[PDB]
DNA sequence: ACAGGATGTATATATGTGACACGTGCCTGGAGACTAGGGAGTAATCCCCTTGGCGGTTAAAACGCGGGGGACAGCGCGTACGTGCGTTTAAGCGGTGCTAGAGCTGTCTACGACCAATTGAGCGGCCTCGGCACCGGGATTCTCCAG
């Protein structure tokens, strides 16, 4: 399978978007503290 | 049975239409010099819109299903239309044989065309408000069993 085809390794989703890096850093601490977050977007495609 | 005349018949040759190619002349293009006016070419204005992505809400589609009542084919059958035929009717293919009546040429006006005025339609800009458009019934009037 790996030799047949190659798909993104899901590391670039966060790397290719700076604002997602700070979001990752924030949600990590917020979950370590036991909080629950509500993430709002205007775009629905952005939800994907 | 045959040797030759008495008729046919395609065969080859000189004479009738047509249609292309040629050869003159006379109109219609071509060539040229002016004079706008038209159109190109920016440069400004006024529209009223512009797009992506997305959330919401209502009705117009979109779909399911039953079922009915029509779309098809088969059967049959009885006109009825084509298929010959014998008749006869009249087109038509050439003729003659006039005359309207196109087609033209010329002549000469009334009749357009500018055209510069003159000015009153007519066109846009607002205002107003009856007149259609829709509500709300209330009768009526079809449609469909159902007997």
Show the tokens assigned to A35.
Answer: 């909080």
DSSP assignment of A1-17 = -TTT-----SSHHHHT-
Q: Are A20 and A12 in contact (CB under 8 A)?
A: no
Question: Rounded to whole angstroms, how far apart are CA atoms A24 and A30?
Answer: 10
User: Is the CB of residue A15 less than 8 Å from the CB of residue A23?
Assistant: no
For residue A40, the SS3 value is coil
d(CA A23, CA A39): 10
Q: Which two tokens stand for residue A10?
A: 């899901």
A48 vs A43: CA distance, rounded Å: 10
From the Cβ of A39, is strand B under 7 Å away? no
Rounded to 5 degrees, what angle do the CA atoms A16, A20, A23 make? Answer: 160
C-beta of residue A19 within 8 angstroms of C-beta of residue A26: no
Does at least one atom of strand B sit less than 7 Å from the CB of A46?
A: yes
A44 Cβ within 7 A of any nucleic strand B atom: yes
């Amino acid at each position: 399978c790996n030799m047949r085809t190659q798909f993104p390794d899901l590391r670039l989703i966060q790397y290719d978007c700076g604002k997602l890096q700070t979001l990752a850093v924030l949600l990590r601490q917020l979950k370590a503290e036991g909080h629950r977050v509500l993430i709002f977007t205007q775009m629905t495609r952005m939800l994907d």
